[PDB]
Structure 1
Amino acid sequence: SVSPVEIAINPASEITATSAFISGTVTKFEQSKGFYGSGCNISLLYWEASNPMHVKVASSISKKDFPADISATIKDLKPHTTYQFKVTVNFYFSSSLQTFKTLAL
């Protein structure tokens, strides 16, 4: 795309009653001196869909080469509960949201 920053989000996999594997990719982060000159923080954030005001950080990394994947197995989830997650770049750019529901226990 013509955008300098592109972020993809993947469907959750390995969904159990209390855990899931969530992931995304910063496909593009075009370098220029200054704000775009040192790579970026990539964070994978998740929350219970009913409470988007309490986020959890599954993973947070610094990268300077793209595409760059980010992933984590999140655990201790509530059974039979809807969760959402996203990838953020520099706590400014966001992927689209992805949603999944844990199994009943």
Structure 2
Amino acid sequence: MVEIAINPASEITATSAFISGTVTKFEQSKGFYGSGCNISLLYWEASNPMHVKVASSISKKDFPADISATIKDLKPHTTYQFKVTVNFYFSSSLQTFKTLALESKSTSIVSTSTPTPSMPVKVTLEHHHHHH
């Protein structure tokens, strides 16, 4: 089967969110083996699934393929749904997330540190982007 793992939506604010997934293994049919599959990770409003917006559109020919999408232009207090569309024929499972209100936090001094930030001698100056 086409195995597409979906990573839970994180870094969610009112206007943006970081979503991702991993296309572990791809299948299609004869003739389409070794094809650069267009990964379009689509998101829409839970209230309006007609507004199919593209979070990210990239091409993958190598699997497992880890893809991520940074969504901006989100509506506050709004529930959204997302899926990874791989090639012209496949879609993943459906996840849903909800944005925040117009009172969001900066999330830089205190961020959700799920991994350990233990790096012997921190050479990287994270003033451009803070790692999760």
TM-score by structure 2 length? Answer: 0.70
List per-residue Cα deviations over 1:18-71 (Å, max 9, x = no partner).
Answer: 110011111002587512232411111001111101101111111111100111
Structure 1: which 5+ runs fail to align? none
Distance 2:60 2:32 in 1: 14
Query: Mean alpha-carbon deviation: is it higher for 88-97 or for 30-39?
Result: 30-39
Distance 2:39 2:18 in 1: 17
- Offset of 1:93 from its aligned partner? 1.1
**Counterpart contact for 2:20–2:67, Cα < 8 Å:** yes
Question: More relative contact order in 1 or in 2 (CA 8 Å, sep 6+)?
Answer: 1
Matched pairs, number: 100
Secondary structure of the structure 1 residue equivalent to 2:15 = coil
From the CA coordinates, give the structure whose radius of gyration is larger.
2
Structure with higher strand content: 1
**Counterpart contact for 2:41–2:55, Cα < 8 Å:** yes
- Would you identify which runs of 4 or more consecutive aligned residues in structure 1 move more than 2 Å? 30-33
**Counterpart contact for 2:37–2:88, Cα < 8 Å:** no
CA RMSD for the aligned pairs?
A: 1.7
**Counterpart contact for 2:56–2:70, Cα < 8 Å:** no
Structure 2: which 5+ runs fail to align? 102-132
Query: Mean alpha-carbon deviation: is it higher for 24-33 or for 67-76?
Result: 24-33
Amino-acid identity (%): 100
Distance 1:50 1:31 in 2: 31
Distance 1:93 1:68 in 2: 14
**Counterpart contact for 1:29–1:36, Cα < 8 Å:** no
**Counterpart contact for 1:31–1:37, Cα < 8 Å:** no
- Select which of 25, 28, 31 maps to 1:34: 31
List per-residue Cα deviations over 1:64-84 (Å, max 9, x = no partner).
Answer: 111001112111211111000
Change (3 A) 1:95 1:31: closer
